Amino acid sequence: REVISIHIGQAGIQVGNACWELYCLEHGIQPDGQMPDAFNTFFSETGAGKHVPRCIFLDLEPTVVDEVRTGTYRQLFHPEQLISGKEDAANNFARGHYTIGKEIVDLALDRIRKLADNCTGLQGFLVFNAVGGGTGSGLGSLLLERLSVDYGKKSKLGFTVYPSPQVSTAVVEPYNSVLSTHSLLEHTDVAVMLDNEAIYDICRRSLDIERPTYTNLNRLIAQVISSLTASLRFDGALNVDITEFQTNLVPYPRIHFMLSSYAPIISAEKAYHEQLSVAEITNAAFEPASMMVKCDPRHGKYMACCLMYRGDVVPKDVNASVATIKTKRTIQFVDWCPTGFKCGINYQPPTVVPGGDLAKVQRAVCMISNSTAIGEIFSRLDHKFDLMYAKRAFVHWYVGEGMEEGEFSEAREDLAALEKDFEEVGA
């Protein structure tokens, strides 16, 4: 039951660094990698006392992979897995998809096939990127298309980071995200959702971090990833692997852009006094001020929830919490969906890290939500795409690199079809 992890771009290969920092301690593996079969789904034991991750980090520029190559985990990965190019896509979907992409994707796919052949019980792929960039968007599309044409019938989990309405660090990122969604709609299988602004807000409020940097963001995204993947590693009461996810949560092949939430995230100064039993952690998982995507889901109707509980959690109290949720008046599911919950329970409480920020909490909850409200991000992206594109701004870079007006128009109209489909399914 193995799943392999691929990281593309700055955001991807930093979130991966956070994830491996988490997993090494979660399984007891020392930095270089030893122990002084839960690991079998992420590491592959080779030789006497040596475990290598089932990942591949890659990027078109080497200044971001060099610190991974020479850092505190220089002894962890296979020295051939930390792929790197020479010139980055330079915030250009076109550049990273048409003239720099066609060099490194072949090597990446060769190593991917090598890892797949080393695997024995392949469950799926899980990739990391932020579609607002160039080497994220273009290279992720170019790599996902080949991965799908190779494997096709195996799950893919893109943990993508869209841009935020007002917290943004680029001008061509609307073009990048629009041109990436046209392919992430069709090639991936489940698109887990993150935003930088929503995580900033949750850091500001729940963790009372006045000035949060990327370290905390990655450190609390890795925990969500571990929570939704811990079913394979640790045997619990109710077991859910990747297959049940996209069979309980995806009603139509075009609605797989699902929000993610987690509760609780309470600092060690409030965890002593806090009451973190199951009912209240569920009620705090379903609150809008704790969802990692900058959206107001109360504007829309839910379609499918997936609640992964970890720790000292029994089944009937989660059933009762679900009862309270479905009796509440402010949140409502679509008419055709009487039951809309998938509850799984695991016996391993979340793991903390030395030098970290969270607390050694007894129980926790991760949540994956498929709801109609997610179309607001797409509508906003369409609007702030067309605002620039009405004057042909920044199109000269893409055109000179090798794109054309037709691709832009077709991506925009595909996003329009997606918005109309969301409005139809919200009826």
């Binding site: 048409y98 003239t99 066609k102 298309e145 044409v149 090798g402």
Partner: peptide, 22 residues
């Protein structure tokens, strides 16, 4: 124009491969 021709040929060949894939 020569480099544009090269890029157009590459893109159209990959497009044909994609169409055959679909």
């Amino acid at each position: 124009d020569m480099e544009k021709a090269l890029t157009k040929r590459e893109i159209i060949s990959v497009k044909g491969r994609a169409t055959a894939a679909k």
